[PDB]
Design a protein around this ligand. Structure first.
Ligand code: HEM
Length: 154
């Protein structure tokens, strides 16, 4: 797929608000994911033991990890499609070490969209959401392709 410059602009416009509080957005997203699709929490030997939302909120480790994830994703979005180098190390670890199915990347995509919709209604109307969804689909398609080359696909 290819986004237009206008679609990238909508994406990087909301993302700039997200970057006002990276750790707080990281928290909401992971907590949204873990509550909605609890099976995803099983992938983290680090976080598996967390029983409640209150425990998740209070985990300093989880908050650091959310900042690591959103900074990696932010660096990809700012490439505006030219993200091949960034994608390589991320595809290799998630396919080969962590073993994360494309399905789970769809689930977190959903969690990111939910959280931007709640926090940023003014900057996340239908068009901006359409553009963010396009950007994350692009991300998933390219990652899926890399999975396949690395011998995991799926
Ligand atoms: C927007 C999508 C994602 C991004 C950009 C991302 C990024 C990262 C980064 C940058 C790291 C640290 C370096 C590395 O191991 O590659 C990491 C580690 C990890 N990621 Fe992700 N990730 C994403 C989605 C997911 C999902 C959906 C799962 C599982 C449901 C997953 C599970 C893990 C695991 C298990 C680790 C290791 C955590 C640890 O013990 O430190 N990732 N991820």
């Amino acid at each position: 797929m290819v986004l237009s410059e206008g679609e990238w602009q909508l994406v990087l416009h909301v993302w700039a608000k997200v970057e006002a509080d990276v750790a707080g957005h990281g928290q909401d997203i992971w907590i949204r994911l873990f509550k909605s699709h609890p099976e995803t929490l099983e992938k983290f030997d680090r976080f598996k033991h967390l029983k409640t939302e209150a425990e998740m909120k209070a985990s300093e480790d989880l908050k650091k990890h959310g900042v690591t994830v959103l900074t990696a994703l932010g660096a990809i979005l700012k490439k505006k499609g030219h993200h091949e180098a960034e994608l390589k190390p991320l595809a290799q670890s998630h396919a080969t070490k962590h073993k994360i199915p494309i399905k789970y990347l769809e689930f977190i995509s959903e969690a990111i969209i939910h959280v931007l919709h709640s926090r940023h209604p003014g900057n996340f109307g239908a068009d901006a959401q359409g553009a963010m969804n396009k950007a994350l689909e692009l991300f998933r398609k390219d990652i899926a392709a890399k999975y396949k080359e690395l011998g995991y696909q799926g």
